[PDB]
């Protein structure tokens, strides 16, 4: 990560008063789980069925 946009890297995550990341894992992880489940598995199988 880069705190400033000088480098060709993704911007660093926001930090709190202490120098530790500020986002909550208990929100992000379920989000990614649901997204992967919907995209990788369900949608592709639905496409297979419609093609058939």
């Amino acid at each position: 990560c880069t705190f400033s946009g000088n480098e060709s890297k993704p911007l660093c995550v926001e930090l709190d008063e202490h120098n530790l990341p500020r986002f909550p894992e208990w929100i992000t992880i379920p989000l990614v789980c649901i997204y992967m489940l919907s995209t990788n598995i369900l949608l592709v199988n639905l496409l297979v069925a419609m093609f058939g």
């Binding site: 639905l46 069925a49 419609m50 058939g52």
Partner: protein, 47 residues
Amino acid sequence: YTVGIVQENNDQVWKFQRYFLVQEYCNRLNIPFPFVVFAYFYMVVKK
């Protein structure tokens, strides 16, 4: 299997929902939304 089964009864349900949506839009002020608020004012003046 489910897609093969429920295909015949899908367009009929969609036509029913289409009636619902069309009547919702017709039973409406039929004004573009970003100015529709004015109507809500003007109309509430009369009502």
